[PDB]
Design a binder for this molecule. Structure first.
Ligand SMILES: Nc1ncnc2c1ncn2[C@@H]1O[C@H](C[C@@H](N)CC[C@H](N)C(=O)O)[C@@H](O)[C@H]1O
Ligand SMILES: Nc1ncnc2c1ncn2[C@@H]1O[C@H](C[C@@H](N)CC[C@H](N)C(=O)O)[C@@H](O)[C@H]1O
Lengths: 331, 333
């Protein structure tokens, strides 16, 4: 199934695994590079399917805990050079202590969490926190694993952290934004509600992880790149490239969520990007006719990137990848 | 749907549309290889939008087989073939019930106005139903109330029942079905193949005369024969069409899950005494870039990729699009 340590072809912080290199089908190679992500713990044959349609390339499984304080198991399918990768600096917090310095005066002896579980879209009610306190207000103890494993399992699933005496709380949006490697208040703005923030963050790249894989693009494109981002979310791929110091000449972003679109746009404006951000609402309108003239106007895409959301939407990733890949092959 | 009426596609032998050619295709769509994909005309909502989307936004050719034979059959064909200089397949299939069934005339009630059959199903009328219908008209001098006329007509239209005796209706025989679809006689007949198995594999096969009219433009294009990649090959409707068109089949890679269908095509292959090779796979899934490359390396590359819809699995269509993209990518080097 999945590997010893989910370190893919290697992580900066750890000793290399046995297989450090790959050879890949000459269909897979050539312009453009592509990068697809999906949840690692997937149902049967799902990864078989994804692989079959992506040139039978073997997916790279890495846990993002090797890059930050939050664990997150993903598979990545790409034709990127695996050699000469480098980690993204400024370096992200590796532990809860580093990520949340003030949380450690309140941290019980029996909570061994040095890493956070996967960050997700919904969040523990005020009730749960009040309840947990009630459970452990009996003090002087370490009270039995009934109470402990209850609290620990609840803290694990909701990512609850100690912020007071016998008191837990969900991660604030900007604590989440930082564990995922986004700018502070990246998702904050306009009409965006609190729960909208959490939802957008729940489904998004861990920027530090993604940056490590995309780092090999920097030496390859000193003049900048054109990016086609499918299912852009809150711009995780584009932020990784910007933090990597790779100029974004042109970016075509396909993104159905309005909130997600505002977030990316504001980011493009706040960072004072000088390239073009071109947006489309639905992936189903990137037809050949359009792609033809995008590529004609702004040159070919050097990278097409996307993550998994509708389960048939994956086939549109495949459909757009090769439309692009075919158009960019004309002798 | 956005279904045209009359449904004559890009032309039919009786209205071949000279002076009309198909508009220039997107550079992505144009061959080689030529591709040809079939699906039922009355698909559910959005299906054809999707199919067209994934095949270079090409407009499907909607055509009723009633313009080619005696049994109506509404299908959509999406392809990158030239339309100009098509020609009808000969020998010519029967256009009406009377021509298809010369001996049915003597038993045909004056009030049964059918001259054409309905879409050939995979399933068939029950001996009770016929028994009933016969029984139901044991009244003298026929012409009984419309209410009974309307009943039997509806049932005859539903199950494609034909008159075979005095007050006697019967389902079409397998070999009568094979005829209407344009296959050789007893094409599906073979050792061990059940009667029910025959009717089934037939009920969802290409109408050969219709398909041949579309593929006819390939004859002048490939005097030295073609290599064919046939996905969801069934009982070999696409191959039978090309053979009957007089186009030599040098290399055919047929992919078919059913063994009954496999044996039928193989039987045809050697009874026809074909010279070229027929290679069988059973899952589209086992057709990957590696294999496709070694296949093209061995046999020279495909001039035609042909496939029929296996569903109204629904995901199998994406395997067709996948395979088409690989083949197309490989040859383009
Ligand atoms: N049907 C669709 N059409 C276009 N975009 C979509 C569709 N479904 C989801 N998306 C986008 O793809 C994203 C889904 C996520 N799996 C991707 C997250 C993204 N990688 C990020 O960095 O946040 C959402 O942010 C949506 O904006
Ligand atoms: N997943 C699959 N892989 C390979 N073959 C299949 C699969 N599903 C269905 N088939 C075969 O493909 C056919 C699907 C039909 N729509 C095609 C009919 C065929 N084109 C004909 O002319 O009669 C069936 O007869 C099946 O035997």
């Amino acid at each position: 199934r999945l590997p010893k340590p989910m370190i893919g072809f290697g992580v900066p912080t750890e000793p290399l695994p046995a297989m450090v290199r790959r050879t890949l089908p000459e269909q897979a190679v050539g312009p453009p590079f592509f990068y697809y992500e999906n949840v690692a713990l997937a149902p049967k044959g799902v990864w078989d399917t994804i692989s079959r349609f992506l040139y039978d390339i073997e997916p790279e499984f890495v846990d993002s805990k090797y890059f930050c304080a939050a664990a997150r198991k993903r598979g990545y399918i790409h034709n990127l050079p695996v050699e000469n990768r480098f980690p993204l600096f400024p370096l992200a917090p590796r532990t809860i202590h580093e990520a949340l310095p003030l949380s450690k005066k309140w941290w019980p002896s029996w909570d061994p969490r040095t890493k956070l579980n996967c960050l997700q879209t919904a969040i523990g009610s005020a009730q749960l926190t009040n309840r947990i306190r009630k459970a452990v207000e009996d003090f002087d103890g370490e009270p039995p694993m009934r109470v402990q494993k209850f609290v620990l399992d609840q803290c694990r699933k909701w990512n609850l952290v100690w912020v007071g005496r016998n008191k837990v709380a969900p991660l604030e949006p900007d604590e989440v934004e930082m564990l995922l490697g986004f700018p502070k208040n990246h998702t904050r703005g306009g009409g965006i509600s609190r729960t909208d923030r959490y939802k957008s963050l729940g489904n998004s790249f861990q920027v530090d992880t993604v940056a490590y894989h995309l780092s090999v693009l920097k030496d390859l494109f000193p003049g900048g790149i054109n990016v086609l981002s499918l299912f852009s979310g809150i711009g995780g791929g584009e932020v990784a490239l910007y933090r990597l110091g790779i100029p974004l000449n042109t970016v075509v972003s396909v993104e159905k969520s309005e909130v997600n679109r505002d977030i990316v746009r504001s980011w493009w404006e706040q960072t004072n990007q000088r390239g073009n951000l071109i947006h489309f609402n639905d992936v189903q309108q990137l037809n050949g006719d359009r792609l033809e003239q995008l590529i004609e106007s702004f040159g070919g895409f050097d990278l097409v990137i996307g993550g998994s959301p509708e389960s048939s939407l994956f086939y549109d990733y495949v459909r757009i990848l090769d439309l692009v890949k075919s158009i960019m092959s004309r002798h």
